[PDB]
């Protein structure tokens, strides 16, 4: 009979928003994000059914833009390496895989440094780097370390994030048990290829998710339950050298002997995880098989991961066939698949040995089954833990009908 408006109506609607950083107490180099750790307010909702779709999520793109902006902002004060296109002189090294590095000498208006074979173009003697002209090389400042530091994500006023506590829940479909929280948990993202490394785990049995599961171009990610102990070793010593062009922080030579970086992984844990995922890969009927990547260039057919500021490229083709794994180390890299920009990434002195685990896997369906790994997209890696988070906008200006005299 009459129109009445009610304030504080608990209703929401999907809309875009701008979040902000959050982290625990301290003292990926931070120094820009706020390290606020308030009291975690966890409120559980009942009789609420809200659909979730992490494939069309917007906070993933927001965090993508934020991390790339922070990376470009931190990389800006570092010195450049653009006038280093002077002709090198690479002879040879200084008991297998001893031809992967050759120390070369540069003019720089004479000093020499140790370089890898794959880090220089085979200009057929005289040699040159992978990209000197038309692609600038920007080194990283050694004053800060880009180690994975746990952070949190919180929404401002008028926005909230819905958390799903249901373990047996994929990316799509409705969510029965949903909870509203102001900030996320202590997520520790890490860049990797064909693996997830550090990250949140999942309970119950194995779980799989995808966008369509029919198209072969779409990637399929599997979240593991039992963590696989993966640590690896780097059996090398190396040295430190500074050449004035501008300090040019790099390795000078080798003390002792040259031995390629390589390690072993647990066999029982790998076999158990492989059988556990194979138990469900036959679902959703045809036989299944494991085959390596199709091919292409580097960092897409082999496992790629970082270990305390040092990139490691390990050959994991034998793991997805039929445990030692040969690994190759390189300093030059092209982060974010950028063209025209490069990262020098100097090494560190002494041997390095980090400790990590396994919380996920990357699978790509083959057309024409033979589930091969690959993809090379970090979006799925970051979305492996953001599946239980979805921002939303609240509009408490509800209207209800009643007879007001």
């Amino acid at each position: 009979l009459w129109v009445t408006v009610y304030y504080g109506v608990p209703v929401w609607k999907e809309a875009k928003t701008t979040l902000f950083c959050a982290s625990d107490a301290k003292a990926w180099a931070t120094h820009a994000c706020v390290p606020t750790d308030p009291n975690p307010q966890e409120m559980v909702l009942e009789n609420v059914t809200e659909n979730f779709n992490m494939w069309k999520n917007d906070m993933v793109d927001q965090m993508h833009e934020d991390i790339i902006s922070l990376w470009d902002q931190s990389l800006k004060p570092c010195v450049k390496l653009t006038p280093l296109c002077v002709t090198l002189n690479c002879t040879n090294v200084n008991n297998n895989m001893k031809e992967e590095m050759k120390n070369c000498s540069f003019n720089t208006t004479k000093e020499y440094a140790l370089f890898y074979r794959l880090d220089i173009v085979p200009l057929n003697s005289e040699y040159r780097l992978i990209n000197c002209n038309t692609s600038t090389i920007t080194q990283i400042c050694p004053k800060v370390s880009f180690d994975p530091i746990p952070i949190h994500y919180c929404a401002p006023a008028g926005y909230a994030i819905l958390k799903c506590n249901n373990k047996t829940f994929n990316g799509t479909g409705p969510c029965n048990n949903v909870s509203t929280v102001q900030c996320t948990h202590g997520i520790k993202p890490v860049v990797s290829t064909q693996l997830l490394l550090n990250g949140s785990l999942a309970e119950e049995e194995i779980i799989i998710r995808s966008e369509n599961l029919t198209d072969n171009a779409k990637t399929i990610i599997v979240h593991l339950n039992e963590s696989v102990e993966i640590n690896c070793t780097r059996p090398n010593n190396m040295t430190r050298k500074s050449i004035r062009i501008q300090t040019f922080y790099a390795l000078g030579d080798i003390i002792g002997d040259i031995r390629q970086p390589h390690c072993n992984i647990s066999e029982a844990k790998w076999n158990k995880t492989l059988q556990r995922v194979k138990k469900k890969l036959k679902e959703h009927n045809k036989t299944i098989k494991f085959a390596p990547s199709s091919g292409g260039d580097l960092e897409i057919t082999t496992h790629s991961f970082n270990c305390r500021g040092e990139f490691f490229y390990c050959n994991t083709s034998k793991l997805f066939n039929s445990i030692t794994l040969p690994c190759r180390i390189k300093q030059i890299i092209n982060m974010w698949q950028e063209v025209g920009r490069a990262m020098y990434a100097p090494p560190i002195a002494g041997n390095i040995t980090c400790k990590s685990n396994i919380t996920g896997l990357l699978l790509t369906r083959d057309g024409g089954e033979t589930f091969r790994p690959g993809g090379g997209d970090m979006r799925d890696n970051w979305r492996s833990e953001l599946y239980k988070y979805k921002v939303v906008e609240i509009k408490p200006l509800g209207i209800a009908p009643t007879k007001c005299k």
Partner: antibody
Amino acid sequence: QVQLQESGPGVVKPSETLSLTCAVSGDSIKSAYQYWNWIRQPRGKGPEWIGGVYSSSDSTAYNPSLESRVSISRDTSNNRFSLNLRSVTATDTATYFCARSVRDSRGWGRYFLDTWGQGLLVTVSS
Amino acid sequence: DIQMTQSPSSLSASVGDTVTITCRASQSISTWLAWYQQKPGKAPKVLIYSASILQSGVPSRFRGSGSGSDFTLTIGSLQIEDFATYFCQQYTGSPFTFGGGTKVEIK
């Protein structure tokens, strides 16, 4: 389905600062991994590359023979990206295109064009 | 600089025949090559990328193969809508040089 639209002057005299813009409909400038490439197709031979701009890092790259004359600029609002060219002379002529490239899943760093525009004939005369 | 060349300039065939286009590169670039179809007027469209993966929406009468520096693309059936100019473009870093350009003729 993403569509590309470009607009600009028809007759442009040489020895000035040329400016062209391209409107993007449907897809956003941010996206995931895309490059807003700017290319030309001179009549007589194949096309040529001028430069491209990243979607998020707003980084850039130019041709090895067109330095200090091309400055690609983009903005978040209006869903469009522009192009600035200096010293047009009698070389920078014919139609211009504002295509988009998507990354390849077979390799790392590969980028190929898949969606193009319509073409804007840039005539140079006295 | 990474130079790109295309040979021959043009050929002559009939409808339903096989057309072979070869592109030679300056150095080995593995399989980092793409093909483009440019019809008379408007803007061209991509044909085959990565030298072996087809495009979603192109007919099955086009097949490409090759590795290293020598590449050759064949056409199973030449239709009325396939009469256009073929261009091969490499994308092994900047710059993104195009091919010389080929054309077909009908007697």
